[PDB]
Amino acid sequence: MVLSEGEWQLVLHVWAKVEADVAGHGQDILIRLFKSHPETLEKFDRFKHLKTEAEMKASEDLKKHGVTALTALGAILKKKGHHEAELKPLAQSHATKHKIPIKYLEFISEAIIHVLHSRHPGNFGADAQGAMNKALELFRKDIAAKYKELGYQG
Numbered sequence: 001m002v003l004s005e006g007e008w009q010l011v012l013h014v015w016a017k018v019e020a021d022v023a024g025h026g027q028d029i030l031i032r033l034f035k036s037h038p039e040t041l042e043k044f045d046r047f048k049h050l051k052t053e054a055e056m057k058a059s060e061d062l063k064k065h066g067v068t069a070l071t072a073l074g075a076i077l078k079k080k081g082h083h084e085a086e087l088k089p090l091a092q093s094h095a096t097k098h099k100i101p102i103k104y105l106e107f108i109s110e111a112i113i114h115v116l117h118s119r120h121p122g123n124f125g126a127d128a129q130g131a132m133n134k135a136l137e138l139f140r141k142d143i144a145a146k147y148k149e150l151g152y153q154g
């Protein structure tokens with residue numbers, strides 16, 4: 001798929017807001033993910049033991065990782081589709097070392113879209129949400145093709 005420049009602008013306009021507080025957005029997103037789809041939490045051996053949302057909130061490690069994850073996503077979105085180099089090391093660790101099914105990357109995409117909608121309603125109307133969704137579908141499609149080249153999905 002190919003996003004137009006107008007779609008990329010909408011995606012990079014709300015991302016610039018996210019970057020004013022990367023650690024807070026990373027927290028919100030991972031928690032949303034773990035509350036919604038608790039099975040995803042089992043993939044994290046470092047966090048697995050967290051029992052409540054108050055425990056998740058207070059985990060410094062969880063917050064640091066959310067910054068790591070968002071920063072990597074942010075560097076991929078700023079490429080505007082030319083992200084093959086960035087995608088390689090990420091598809092290799094998630095498919096071979098962590099073992100994250102595509103289905104889970106759909107669950108976090110939903111969590112990202114939920115959180116941006118809540119925090120940024122003015123910069124995340126229907127057209128901007130459709131453009132972010134398009135950018136994440138692209139990301140998933142490219143990641144899934146890489147998984148297949150690496151021997152993991154399908």
Ligand code: HEM
Nearest residue numbers: 040043044046068069072073090093094098100104105108
């Ligand atoms: C927006 C998509 C995602 C991005 C950009 C992302 C990015 C990253 C980055 C940059 C790291 C550290 C370096 C490495 O291990 O590759 C990481 C580690 C990890 N990721 Fe992701 N990830 C994504 C989705 C997920 C999902 C959906 C799951 C699981 C349900 C997952 C599970 C993990 C685990 C288990 C680690 C290791 C955590 C620790 O260090 O122990 N990731 N991810």
